[PDB]
Amino acid sequence: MQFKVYTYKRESRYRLFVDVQSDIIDTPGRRMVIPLASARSDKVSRELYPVVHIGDEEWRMMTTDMASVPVSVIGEEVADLSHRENDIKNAINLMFWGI
Amino acid sequence: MQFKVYTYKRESRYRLFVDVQSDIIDTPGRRMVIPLASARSDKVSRELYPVVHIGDEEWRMMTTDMASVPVSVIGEEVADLSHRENDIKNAINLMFWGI
Ligand SMILES: [Cl-]
Ligand SMILES: [Cl-]
Ligand SMILES: [Cl-]
Ligand SMILES: [Cl-]
């Protein structure tokens, strides 16, 4: 579901992803997601890589590592980032349409 | 480069991808791309999966298989789809923001 955060059931580069696909766009067995990296370089653009807060820690939304995942790898839902829809939307639009 | 079509140097599900990343968005060593599938089911949405023409054949832009690729896998440039920027933009925006 769009803006919900999930763990990977199978080991990936990162440990969390946010679903960014529209809830009325149907891809049977898959969803478009952006991985979240532990925020641990400060000067990297916050416009393209928003900082979000999950499990009492900072994470960078790795916008340029966007990829589809099969539902078979989608594990527990850990959080909802719908309150950050404005920065998520700004980041996604910047990556394709910037300047 | 945005809207340019390339072959994969290493075997992938598909054989072509279109660069969809802005030319002023810098991801050292990588680019955001959408694979092209040989068009060979007709009733699949042309709004979400545009039909394009390369090497005298029809291809579907596999919008929901969007992923980053390392420059190391980017082979020969085979075509330019900049003339289809309107349908490509419509498809990408539909996948995130549809309804
Ligand atoms: Cl991490
Ligand atoms: Cl947050
Ligand atoms: Cl194919
Ligand atoms: Cl075309």
Author numbering:
A (entry chain A), B (entry chain A): 1 to 40, 43 to 101
Which lines from the publication concern this structure?
The primary experimental system utilised is a 101-residue homo-dimeric protein, CcdB (Controller of Cell Death protein B), which is a part of the toxin-antitoxin (CcdB-CcdA) module involved in the maintenance of F-plasmid in Escherichia coli. To understand the structural basis of stabilization, crystal structures of three CcdB suppressor mutants, namely, S12G, V46L and S60E, were solved. The structures of the S12G, V46L and S60E mutants of CcdB were solved to resolutions of 1.63 Å, 1.35 Å and 1.93 Å respectively. On similar lines, in this study, the crystal structures of CcdB mutants reveal that the suppressors S12G, V46L and S60E possess novel hydrogen-bonds with water molecules or adjacent residues, that were absent in the wild type protein and are likely responsible for stabilisation of the native state of the protein by these suppressors.
The structures of S12G, V46L and S60E consist of a single chain in the asymmetric unit, with two chloride ions. In the present study, we selected three such suppressor substitutions, Y8D, V46L and S60E with ΔTm˃3°C. The suppressors Y8D, V46L and the suppressor S60E were ~3 kcal/mol and ~4 kcal/mol respectively more stable than the WT. The WT could refold back till 2 M GdnCl, whereas the suppressors Y8D, V46L and suppressor S60E could refold even at 3 and 4 M GdnCl respectively. For S60E also, the major deviation is in the starred loop region A39-V46. E60 is involved in a series of salt-bridge interactions with R48, H55 and R62. There is a change in the orientation of the mobile R48 side chain resulting in salt bridge interactions with E60. The S60E mutation has resulted in reduced B-factor differences between the side chain and main chain in many regions, including R48, resulting in overall stabilisation of the structure. The average B-factors of the S60E structure are also lower than the WT with the most reductions in the loops 8–14 and 39–46. S60E, though not involved directly in CcdA interaction, alters the conformation and rigidity of the 39–46 loop that contacts CcdA and might therefore affect CcdB function.
